[PDB]
Amino acid sequence: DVKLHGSWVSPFNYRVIWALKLKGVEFEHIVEDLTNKSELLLKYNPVYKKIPVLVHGGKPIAESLVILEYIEETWPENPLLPTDPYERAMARFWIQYGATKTAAFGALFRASGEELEKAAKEVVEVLRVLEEQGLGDKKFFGGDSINLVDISFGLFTCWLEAIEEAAGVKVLEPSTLPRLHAWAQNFIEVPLIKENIPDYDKLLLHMKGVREKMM
Amino acid sequence: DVKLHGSWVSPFNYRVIWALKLKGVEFEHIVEDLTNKSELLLKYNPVYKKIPVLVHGGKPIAESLVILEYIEETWPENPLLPTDPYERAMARFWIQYGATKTAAFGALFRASGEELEKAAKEVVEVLRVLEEQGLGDKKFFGGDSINLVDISFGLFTCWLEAIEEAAGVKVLEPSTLPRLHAWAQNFIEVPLIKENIPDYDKLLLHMKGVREKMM
Ligand SMILES: N[C@@H](CCC(=O)N[C@@H](CS)C(=O)NCC(=O)O)C(=O)O
Ligand SMILES: N[C@@H](CCC(=O)N[C@@H](CS)C(=O)NCC(=O)O)C(=O)O
């Protein structure tokens, strides 16, 4: 009844895997080869031709952030958003902030030397705003358990770790971002996340390849 | 009880004016001078330092799309989103598509000659996808009356008209985009929109100035 056109490396696909598993929703995972996109992928997502694409009752939902809100509204038990409208607006605000700033991480795949150091310090500033104004002293962005905001920021854990290793730069460090680094460790230790993340060696090999092709 | 830090020209501010007026919410409009931002603006929106900023019960909400969803959740009567989760996901999908593609309109303020013609045809393609896959044969994106999707696309009416006149290019024409052009006329004729839009001559003079400074 639920299908997910995905991948074993895309952080955007993993957001959807986490939300479905948090809801206890049974689904078929269909791994797409992005060099040979399926007929169903192109039919279901003609606008972007990207994964993830959730298909529920034969009807498709593309874009990870749109899919997450659909899952939250369709399976409302064990909520991943707060009930208060102001708190919900803050969650949407931070999710949107991450989506706009995710482009600044692309410079870690292209820049070198004194330019890559500049890109890394700009990423640290992006993360510091998120840490200071978004996370604060909470264990998770969701408070005492993960919510859609933690899910939207999960790419700053093993995916960012792999990018740091592939590029030879440090971004999310305990000395510079103490609370955000503790959060990244706590997020990765949540059993649902621990049991549903790509193998680090494979992810690192993928990131090295992306940096290789993007110079 | 409700304050809006805004402007008399920003299309993003006008999205919020429309949603508040559709809800019958009383508000104070505080027009910001963006060359001399108020103490309250900088305190309420430290992340972007932009307008609009809604302040409700002394608590601020920045980013027009975040504000629109907050207004819809806070004042749920006379809904601006559908009830069905799949239809709500489609509305969010199209709003997101507009937000990502709004950057392609920036080239109409910078490019000239055979390059500006290229930017205009790329904008027509963006609008054609919206017309064919989003609007379809409905009178409005909201069906028989305007919703958050029409509000999010309202900048493609008099704001885009002013940009076309300032740049000397044509984008939203009846021959090329028949349904979207009829929608733009119908949107502007809705009494709530008609009574709450900037004066066209002032808006055109503003767009000419933006094109002048952005070459
Ligand atoms: N904004 C999209 C981004 C998804 C995305 O970039 N997907 C990539 C995989 S990580 C993709 O499908 N790329 C298509 C390709 O490489 O042709 C979302 O959040 O779902
Ligand atoms: N993404 C924001 C965009 C708002 C925006 O760009 N605001 C402009 C006015 S149209 C602004 O405040 N600019 C600040 C400046 O010029 O310093 C939204 O949707 O609210």
* CATH number of the domain enclosing B6: 3.40.30.10
| Torsion angle of the four alpha carbons A79, A83, A87, A90, in this order, in degrees rounded to the nearest 10 | 50
Structural domain count of chain B: 2
Please tell me whether residues A19 and A116 are part of one structural domain: no
The reply, when asked if residue A51 is annotated as ligand binding, is yes
From A62, A37, A71, A47, select the one nearest A151 (Cα to Cα).
A71
Distance B19 CA to ligand 1 centre (A): 32
Q: Beta strand B53-56 with B28-31: parallel, antiparallel or unpaired?
A: unpaired
Asked if residue A46 is part of any domain, the answer here is yes
Asked if residue A80 is part of any domain, the answer here is no
Residue having the nearest C-alpha atom to atom 12 of ligand 2: B50
Q: Which of B33, B49, B74 is the last residue of a domain?
A: B74
Please give the Cα distance from A210 to A213 (Å, whole number).
Answer: 5
Phi, psi of A59 (to 5 degrees): -105, 130
Residues 6+ apart with CB under 8 A from A80: A19, A22, A68, A71, A72, A142, A146, A147, A148, A151
Is there a contact between A62 and A45 (Cβ–Cβ < 8 Å)? yes
- Specify the CATH number for the domain of residue A135: 1.20.1050.10
Asked if residue A177 is part of any domain, the answer here is yes
Distances A203 to A29, A82, A182, B150 between C-alpha atoms, Å: 19, 32, 22, 41
Asked if residue B43 is part of any domain, the answer here is yes
> Which of A56, A69, A85 minimises the CB distance to B92?
A69
Please tell me whether residues B36 and B69 are part of one structural domain: yes
Is there a contact between B44 and B55 (Cβ–Cβ < 8 Å)? yes
Please tell me whether residues A27 and A7 are part of one structural domain: yes
Please give the Cα distance from B167 to B120 (Å, whole number).
Answer: 10
What's CA B103's distance to the chain center, in Å?
Answer: 13
Distance A23 CA to ligand 1 centre (A): 23
Residues 6+ apart with CB under 8 A from B76: none
Q: Which of A74, A105, A121 is the last residue of a domain?
A: A74
Is there a contact between B64 and B12 (Cβ–Cβ < 8 Å)? yes
Half-sphere CA count of A57, side-chain side, radius 13 A? 3
Asked if residue A79 is part of any domain, the answer here is no
Is there a contact between A27 and A52 (Cβ–Cβ < 8 Å)? no
Solved with: X-ray
Please tell me whether residues B29 and B125 are part of one structural domain: no
| Torsion angle of the four alpha carbons B60, B30, B21, B27, in this order, in degrees rounded to the nearest 10 | 70
Please give the Cα distance from A61 to B134 (Å, whole number).
Answer: 14
In b/e form, how buried is each residue of B140-168, taking b as 16+ CB within 10 angstroms? bbbeeebbbbbbbbbbbbbbbbbbbebbe
Residue A155, beta-bridge partner list: none
Distances A13 to A26, A95, A105, B154 between C-alpha atoms, Å: 16, 16, 18, 32
How many Cβ atoms are within 10 Å of A53's Cβ, its own excluded?
27
The residue length of chain A stands at 215
Residues 6+ apart with CB under 8 A from A170: A120, A164
> Which of A63, A89, A133 minimises the CB distance to B96?
A63
Token pair, residue B65, equals 């799309």
| Closest ligand by atom to B4 CA | 2
Helices (H), chain B: 11-23, 39-44, 64-74, 85-101, 116-129, 148-153, 158-167, 178-189, 191-194, 200-213
The residue length of chain B stands at 215
Which single residue is written with the structure tokens 């600044």? A104
Token pair, residue B200, equals 């066209």
Is there a contact between B71 and B23 (Cβ–Cβ < 8 Å)? yes
The DSSP code for A24 is T
Please give the Cα distance from A153 to A53 (Å, whole number).
Answer: 19
Half-sphere CA count of A83, side-chain side, radius 13 A? 3
Asked if residue A152 is part of any domain, the answer here is yes
Please give the Cα distance from B22 to B4 (Å, whole number).
Answer: 15
Q: Which of B43, B74, B105 is the last residue of a domain?
A: B74
Helices (H), chain A: 11-23, 39-44, 64-74, 85-101, 116-129, 148-153, 158-167, 178-189, 191-194, 200-213
Residues 6+ apart with CB under 8 A from A13: A4, A6, A7, A51, A52, A64
Burial category of A188 from C-beta neighbours within 10 Å (exposed 0-12, middle 13-18, buried 19 and up): middle
From B36, B212, B10, select the one nearest B112 (Cα to Cα).
B212
Please tell me whether residues B39 and B101 are part of one structural domain: no
Is there a contact between A37 and A52 (Cβ–Cβ < 8 Å)? no
Resolution for this model in angstroms, one decimal place? Answer: 1.6
Asked if A129 lies within 8 A of B47 by C-beta distance, the reply is: yes
Residues 6+ apart with CB under 8 A from B36: none
Please tell me whether residues A96 and A200 are part of one structural domain: yes
Is there a contact between A139 and A190 (Cβ–Cβ < 8 Å)? no
Asked if residue A200 is part of any domain, the answer here is yes
Element (H, E) at A4: strand A2-6
Asked if residue B80 is part of any domain, the answer here is no
Atom of ligand 1 nearest to the CA of A7: 9
Q: Give A83's contacts in chain B (Cβ within 8 Å).
A: none
Please give the Cα distance from A50 to A188 (Å, whole number).
Answer: 26
Residues 6+ apart with CB under 8 A from A96: B63, B65, B66
Please tell me whether residues B65 and B117 are part of one structural domain: no
How many Cβ atoms are within 10 Å of A68's Cβ, its own excluded?
25
Asked if B129 lies within 8 A of A47 by C-beta distance, the reply is: yes
Half-sphere CA count of B113, side-chain side, radius 13 A? 1
Please tell me whether residues B181 and B102 are part of one structural domain: yes
Residues 6+ apart with CB under 8 A from B183: B131, B135, B139, B140, B141
Q: In what order do the strands lie in the sheet with B53-56?
A: B28-31, B2-6, B53-56, B59-62
- String of DSSP letters for B2-57: EEEEE-SS-HHHHHHHHHHHHHT---EEEE--TTS--HHHHHH-TTT--S-EEEET
Please give the Cα distance from A11 to A51 (Å, whole number).
Answer: 10
Please tell me whether residues A98 and A21 are part of one structural domain: no
Which single residue is written with the structure tokens 């937000």? B99
Please tell me whether residues B68 and B171 are part of one structural domain: no
Q: Which residues of B touch A (CB under 8 A)?
A: 46-47, 56, 59, 61-63, 65-67, 69-70, 73-74, 85-86, 88-89, 92-93, 96-97, 129, 133
Is there a contact between B198 and B158 (Cβ–Cβ < 8 Å)? yes
The DSSP code for B62 is E
Residue A21 domain boundaries: 2-74
Which single residue is written with the structure tokens 């000659």? B113
| Torsion angle of the four alpha carbons A199, A205, A209, A215, in this order, in degrees rounded to the nearest 10 | 110
Is there a contact between A63 and B93 (Cβ–Cβ < 8 Å)? yes
Please tell me whether residues B132 and B189 are part of one structural domain: yes
Q: Beta strand B28-31 with B2-6: parallel, antiparallel or unpaired?
A: parallel
Please tell me whether residues A139 and A179 are part of one structural domain: yes
